[PDB]
Amino acid sequence: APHLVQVDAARALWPLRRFWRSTGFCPPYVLSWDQQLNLAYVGAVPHRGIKQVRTHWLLELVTTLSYNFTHLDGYLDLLRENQLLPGFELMGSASGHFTDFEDKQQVFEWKDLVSSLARRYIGRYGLAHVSKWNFETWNEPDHHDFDNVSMTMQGFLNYYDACSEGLRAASPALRLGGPGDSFHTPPRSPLSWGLLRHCHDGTNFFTGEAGVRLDYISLHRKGARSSISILEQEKVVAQQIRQLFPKFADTPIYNDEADPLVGWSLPQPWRADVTYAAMVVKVIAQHQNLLLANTTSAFPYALLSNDNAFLSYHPHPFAQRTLTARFQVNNTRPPHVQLLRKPVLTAMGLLALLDEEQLWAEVSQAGTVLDSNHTVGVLASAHRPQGPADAWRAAVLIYASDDTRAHPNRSVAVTLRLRGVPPGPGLVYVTRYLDNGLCSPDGEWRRLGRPVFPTAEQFRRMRAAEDPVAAAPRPLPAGGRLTLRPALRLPSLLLVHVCARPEKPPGQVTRLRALPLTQGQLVLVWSDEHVGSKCLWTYEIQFSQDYTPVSRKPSTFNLFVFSPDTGAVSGSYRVRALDYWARPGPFSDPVPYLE
Ligand SMILES: *[C@@H]1O[C@H](CO)[C@@H](O[C@@H]2O[C@H](CO)[C@@H](O[C@@H]3O[C@H](CO[C@H]4O[C@H](CO)[C@@H](O)[C@H](O)[C@@H]4O)[C@@H](O)[C@H](O[C@H]4O[C@H](CO)[C@@H](O)[C@H](O)[C@@H]4O)[C@@H]3O)[C@H](O)[C@H]2NC(C)=O)[C@H](O)[C@H]1NC(C)=O
Ligand SMILES: *[C@@H]1O[C@H](CO)[C@@H](O[C@@H]2O[C@H](CO)[C@@H](O)[C@H](O)[C@H]2NC(C)=O)[C@H](O)[C@H]1NC(C)=O
Ligand SMILES: *[C@@H]1O[C@H](CO)[C@@H](O)[C@H](O)[C@H]1NC(C)=O
Numbered sequence: 001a002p003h004l005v006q007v008d009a010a011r012a013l014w015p016l017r018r019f020w021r022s023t024g025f026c027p028p029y030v031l032s033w034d035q036q037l038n039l040a041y042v043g044a045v046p047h048r049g050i051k052q053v054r055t056h057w058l059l060e061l062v063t064t065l066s067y068n069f070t071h072l073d074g075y076l077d078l079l080r081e082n083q084l085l086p087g088f089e090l091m092g093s094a095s096g097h098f099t100d101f102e103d104k105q106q107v108f109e110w111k112d113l114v115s116s117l118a119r120r121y122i123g124r125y126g127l128a129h130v131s132k133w134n135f136e137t138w139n140e141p142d143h144h145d146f147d148n149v150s151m152t153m154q155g156f157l158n159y160y161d162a163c164s165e166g167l168r169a170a171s172p173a174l175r176l177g178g179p180g181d182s183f184h185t186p187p188r189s190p191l192s193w194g195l196l197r198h199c200h201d202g203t204n205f206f207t208g209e210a211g212v213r214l215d216y217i218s219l220h221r222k223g224a225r226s227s228i229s230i231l232e233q234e235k236v237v238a239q240q241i242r243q244l245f246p247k248f249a250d251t252p253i254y255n256d257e258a259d260p261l262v263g264w265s266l267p268q269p270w271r272a273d274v275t276y277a278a279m280v281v282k283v284i285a286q287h288q289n290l291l292l293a294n295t296t297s298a299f300p301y302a303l304l305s306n307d308n309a310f311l312s313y314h315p316h317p318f319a320q321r322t323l324t325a326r327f328q329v330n331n332t333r334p335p336h337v338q339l340l341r342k343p344v345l346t347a348m349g350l351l352a353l354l355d356e357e358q359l360w361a362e363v364s365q366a367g368t369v370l371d372s373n374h375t376v377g378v379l380a381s382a383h384r385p386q387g388p389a390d391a392w393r394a395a396v397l398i399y400a401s402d403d404t405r406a407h408p409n410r411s412v413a414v415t416l417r418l419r420g421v422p423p424g425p426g427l428v429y430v431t432r433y434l435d436n437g438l439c440s441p442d443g444e445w446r447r448l449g450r451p452v453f454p455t456a457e458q459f460r461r462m463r464a465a466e467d468p469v470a471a472a473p474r475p476l477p478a479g480g481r482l483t484l485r486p487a488l489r490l491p492s493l494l495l496v497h498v499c500a501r502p503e504k505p506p507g508q509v510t511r512l513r514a515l516p517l518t519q520g521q522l523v524l525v526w527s528d529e530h531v532g533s534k535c536l537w538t539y540e541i542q543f544s545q546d547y548t549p550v551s552r553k554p555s556t557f558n559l560f561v562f563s564p565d566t567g568a569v570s571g572s573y574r575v576r577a578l579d580y581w582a583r584p585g586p587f588s589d590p591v592p593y594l595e
């Protein structure tokens with residue numbers, strides 16, 4: 001008996017906030033070419049689909065009274081160039097200087113350091129930019145994640161105050177949260193619980209004032225292979241904080257390491273394919289629907305981050321918890337690195353197509369209503385037209401997922417009933433679909449027999465499996481209703497996209513860059529910020545040697561790899577957007593390429 005998915009496009013319920021646009025990693029480096037390509041891939045997720053890169057040990061990128069901010073400057077500039085912000089964990093020993101936070105002199109030093117860098121980058125990027133950054137405490141303080149730094153309970157509070165007072169000294173508009181830990185039942189997690197007690201009731205190291213600013217409470221809760229388990233753990237902790245610290249009742253809670261499984265490096269075959277990709281969306285669905293959709297209890301939940309920006313290492317290029325697949329091709333002159341877009345990362349661009357309002361949606365199987373705590377679920381959105389640039393949109397993301405278990409031998413019949421689409425000019429819909437059969441670069445890698453140093457052609461073939469299967473813009477039936485009967489696989493993802501034709505064509509592509517990969521092979525990357533619409537089919541890429549179009553299959557991801565048959569890559573590249581109604585936008589400024 002089929003699953004029935006119902007969407008009412010006229011019933012725009014409440015604000016839908018894109019609360020999941022974050023990633024992270026821990027260095028074992030961050031300036032290496034590998035890492036440069038990685039963040040080019042992250043920033044390429046369309047429509048600002050990933051905003052924050054929560055980076056450990058950022059204050060080991062600074063040497064030592066004055067400091068060398070050269071390495072930190074480089075990483076942050078790198079982030080900036082890919083339209084990303086750091087999850088700025090005030091974490092590190094400033095290359096070995098700081099050792100004890102019960103040393104009164106060291107607490108003062110740390111304050112002045114924090115003020116120093118904060119002011120530095122306000123001058124570098126502007127207060128309007130830096131104010132968006134989530135400054136954070138040392139990651140997992142209860143896990144003894146300290147190196148040679150001594151950090152007792154008392155020391156952690158001194159540390160915190162200095163972080164707080166130092167940031168304030170730069171500017172009061174700068175946000176600060178913590179502790180970034182798990183919050184297990186007392187006497188467990190003393191430093192995490194101790195922090196809240198201090199912020200709530202203790203006195204400020206510097207000002208002697210009762211109460212210390214705490215802008216958000218971040219925690220780490222992981223699902224141990226269960227998607228709903230994450231949400232369950234969050235409720236328990238969040239309620240314990242509502243009742244124990246009544247001042248923090250409205251304080252936003254982040255979960256900046258909300259992963260299905262602890263241990264990023266541990267190889268898992270589900271991490272390789274759409275199994276991960278579907279489960280990540282299930283978590284986001286579970287969160288939106290079963291927590292943030294006016295379910296009278298509404299805890300202030302603002303951020304979910306998947307700590308999955310790590311780079312893979314051999315012999316596990318796909319199986320690790322990473323957005324991209326790394327290949328260290330060691331047998332060319334010289335050795336060069338190549339990255340592949342895993343299903344999860346492709347899906348972060350599917351999620352990205354959702355808009356500011358949630359629509360009413362219901363999933364049932366033969367009468368019985370099923371919430372997102374089931375193998376199938378849906379997130380539906382609608383958009384209120386801003387300028388002449390955009391028009392009305394509906395984003396319907398349906399998922400099929402049994403968590404960390406895949407089922408290749410089963411097919412899931414679904415009937416989508418869409419109703420109540422506000423009438424308007426040239427309404428069309430576009431399906432986008434991902435499964436392990438049709439969209440697994442890991443799948444292709446294995447068809448090609450697991451080459452360790454893939455060739456150009458092997459790399460072309462593996463790449464062809466990144467983008468989801470799409471169908472040409474078909475006009476919507478009259479009445480503002482659509483009925484489809486897709487046969488979904490387990491796992492899969494299906495995004496039906498309904499768009500009305502806006503007044504003016506799309507905006508101009510900007511910030512175009514060419515990035516060398518190897519002989520006769522490069523990365524083209526850009527930005528959609530000035531495009532101002534989500535109703536896009538593909539990006540036209542033209543090449544000049546003296547312009548003719550690079551004939552490629554459709555893709556809206558803001559990153560393309562040019563690996564042509566001729567080996568000819570030197571010349572000039574321009575890029576423009578193409579919408580669902582065949583309309584061209586303005587070409588970006590041409591970018592030259594010398595090899
Ligand atoms: C092409 O050439 C590149 C270098 O140019 C090679 O890349 C190296 O690949 C190996 C992968 O085997 C890497 O070594 C591995 O590092 C892992 C973690 O690195 C850091 O993190 C841990 C803890 O977080 C630290 O302890 C460590 O000091 C590092 O800072 C380790 O987990 C791996 O050890 C595990 O596997 C080995 C088997 O390989 C077991 O013996 C161990 O017991 C353990 O389970 C491993 O040491 C290495 O970092 C890479 N170097 C670089 C510069 O990238 C490629 O190997 C090469 N390609 C081919 C095909 O050979
Ligand atoms: C999500 O669904 C599962 C059912 O699969 C719920 O788990 C059950 O919870 C009840 C509590 O009333 C237990 O007695 C059962 O033993 C659980 N069932 C199984 C199969 O383990 C879970 O609580 C649901 N969670 C949410 C947040 O709705
Ligand atoms: C800081 O360190 C970098 C990299 O090690 C070095 O090149 C640079 O000269 C240093 N800058 C200053 C001002 O000392």
Ligand SMILES: O=C(O)[C@@H]1NC[C@H](O)[C@@H](O)[C@@H]1O
Nearest residue numbers: 025026140262263264265307
């Ligand atoms: O779960 C992990 O693998 C790691 N745990 C410890 C670190 O906090 C985090 O960066 C990683 O996600």
